[PDB]
């Protein structure tokens, strides 16, 4: 059906818009007055919120696969999402802040962050297998097409969020900049409630985990084959962890390098009365993916299916890993050229309210290093979801998807730890980032080459593991 497959895409779009409207300007929301949070306290709060969104995903999937069902768990998680989102407009508005109020407004904002984190975790764990279930009966090709358009909806929600919500948050107001994500969560909940009349709902199977927890025999063939498939999908999820570290380090270091390239400032919208948000620099990957997914689904996918190339999702993940390694190499080359450039010519450009010291190198020189990563998310990301759905046992698809997102979060935190590791004085690749705040003295080229080497090793290991998985 197209009504259910449109309702799922729309509610995922709204959920992603709300999530990116929260994360994009959360640190600066707490740092700025009247919250007056410390320099690292807001970053710690954001890190805790993201870690919650990643850690609650397997439990959010277990809740939908054992107790509530996939359809009802998304409704409950969106209700919790909206309840936790309501704190941010309430806190930002000074008329309603008195009711709510590691700082003066710590409890209300931390309760909101916890609720939004749990809501994001459960929605992410449950809505993509629930979305796939609508066209599951039409074959694996229909599931792949739905995952293409699901990632397109995710990235369109990211585009709308980081473009409008972030701009309104920074240059208009934080009351009407944070009210729109709450309205987005409300609209997602309303859309899901309306589409419940057309959704295909699989009843929960509470005992399905119990057998998996326990291990002719005492158990049926299906309940032991579920464990046999889980113990085969766990190594593949583990092998994707370094890919997650590399990719989540791209998502940060590419923005860091963007800020230190000559961003073409707009004299109309981003002129002196307003500011250029730093989320617009994170928006480039989603901008490219918006144009790449329709090309993949309408042109690349039919050709690859006609000629039979890359039928398995693991091979697609492998080619995505290769493309993200190529993106790391291109970023390293561009950063070497940039660090050569910023020795005799450094310009000042203001992003938000921070005066970064860029080189005389156009920001669009990140197009070759972003297009490649975009292609990576065309292959490595979307197919990952497919492998998290196709290879999951029929009774614990939400749990396996939540575990896939939890391992994505484990990779993200391992990448944060690796960035902190290369920041030590012993290595010093990114050590000169806190004294002055610019990567002009930081060896980000060496870090990008390290990410490329890590991704090459990960691609080799993943080729081995994918060959073993398909025998």
């Amino acid at each position, epitope marked *: 059906r197209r009504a259910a497959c449109g309702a799922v895409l729309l509610t995922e779009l709204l959920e992603r818009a709300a999530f990116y409207g929260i994360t994009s300007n959360l640190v600066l929301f707490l740092n700025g007055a009247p919250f007056c949070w410390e320099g690292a306290q807001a970053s710690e709060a954001l890190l805790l919120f993201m870690g919650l969104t990643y850690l609650g995903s397997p439990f959010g999937g277990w809740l939908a696969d054992a107790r509530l069902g996939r359809a009802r768990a998304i409704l409950l998680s969106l209700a919790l999402y909206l309840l936790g989102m309501l704190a941010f407009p309430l806190l930002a508005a000074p008329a309603t802040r008195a009711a709510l109020c590691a700082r003066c407004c710590s409890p209300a904002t931390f309760a909101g962050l916890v609720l939004v984190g749990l809501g994001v975790a459960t929605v992410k764990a449950n809505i993509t297998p629930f979305g796939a279930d609508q066209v599951k009966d039409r074959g694996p090709e229909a599931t792949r097409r739905f995952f293409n358009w699901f990632y397109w909806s995710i990235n369109l929600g990211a585009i709308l969020s980081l473009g409008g919500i972030a701009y309104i948050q920074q240059n208009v107001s934080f009351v009407t900049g944070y009210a729109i994500p709450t309205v987005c969560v409300g609209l997602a909940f309303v859309v899901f409630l309306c589409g419940q009349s057309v959704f295909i709902t699989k009843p929960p199977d509470g005992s399905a985990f119990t057998d998996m927890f326990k291990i002719g025999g005492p158990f049926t063939e299906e309940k032991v084959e579920d464990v046999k498939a889980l113990v085969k999908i766990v190594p593949v999820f583990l092998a994707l962890i370094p890919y997650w570290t590399v990719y989540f380090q791209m998502q940060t270091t590419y923005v860091l390098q963007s800020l230190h390239l000559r961003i073409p400032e707009i004299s109309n919208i981003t002129t*002196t009365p307003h500011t250029l948000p730093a989320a617009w620099l994170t928006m480039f990957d989603a901008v490219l993916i918006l144009l790449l997914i329709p090309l993949k689904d309408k042109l690349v996918d039919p050709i690859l299916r006609r000629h039979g190339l890359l039928p398995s999702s693991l091979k697609r993940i492998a080619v995505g890993m290769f493309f993200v390694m190529c993106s790391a190499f291109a970023a390293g080359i561009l950063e070497s050229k940039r660090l050569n450039l910023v*020795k005799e*010519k450094t310009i000042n450009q203001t992003i*938000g*309210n921070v005066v970064y*010291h860029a080189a005389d190198l156009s920001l669009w020189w990140q197009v070759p290093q972003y297009l490649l990563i975009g292609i990576s998310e065309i292959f490595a990301s979307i197919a990952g979801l497919e492998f998290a759905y196709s290879a999951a046992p029929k009774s614990m698809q939400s749990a396996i998807m939540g575990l896939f997102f939890f391992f994505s979060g484990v990779g993200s935190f391992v990448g944060s730890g690796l960035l902190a590791l290369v920041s030590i004085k012993a290595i010093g690749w990114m050590s000169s980032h806190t004294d002055f*705040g610019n990567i*002009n003295g930081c060896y980000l080229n060496y870090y990008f080459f390290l990410l490329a080497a890590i991704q090459g090793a990960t691609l080799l290991l993943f080729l081995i593991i994918s060959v073993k998985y398909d025998h």
Partner: antibody
Amino acid sequence: QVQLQQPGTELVRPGASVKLSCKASGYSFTRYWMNWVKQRPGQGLEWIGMVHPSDSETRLNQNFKDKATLTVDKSSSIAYMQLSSPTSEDSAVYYCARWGAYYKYDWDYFDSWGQGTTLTV
Amino acid sequence: DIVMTQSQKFMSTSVGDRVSVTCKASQNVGTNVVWYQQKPGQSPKVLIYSASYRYSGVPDRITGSGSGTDFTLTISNVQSEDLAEYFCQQYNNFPYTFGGGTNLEIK
């Protein structure tokens, strides 16, 4: 030892062309932005253009467009600023400030200034 | 064009007293304000960058504070040397705009 030598009095006639000079010495000339500031006798400072003496990329002030023209002679390590047709309100003390900010150093202040050339018309 | 208003043109202070010159930016400049000290018949000398820091050689009595719209340069141990016009410059947006200038009138 960063010295931005300035000539001093620059008496001229209205409608002429004025080329204030600033000899930058004691430092690598072609790595820091050389800005020009104008202080009227009874007003505050007015930042009027910057030039990077490596590409001569002049980021002029909009109020001082078509008035000021920032040039650089890299051979003699001098920064010139030319006023075209200076009227009676162009008489002021023009400082040639440096801008202390470059590779790895986010200092972001005017650092070393010139003695200021007192343009009188 | 951030009109960087220093509403108090003249501050009268005494030796050993404390004077806090103020500077209200037109927009949210951020920690992007430099305080200069133009002594009589001299070019301005950078006193405090980033609105809270201290240039090398500042006698540490001249502290800086503020962020966003409002900034403040406080001298808590005014000597006879601090007889100068204090200029509040923003480098957050182009063109760079200075304050109207505040000069200490030591009495």
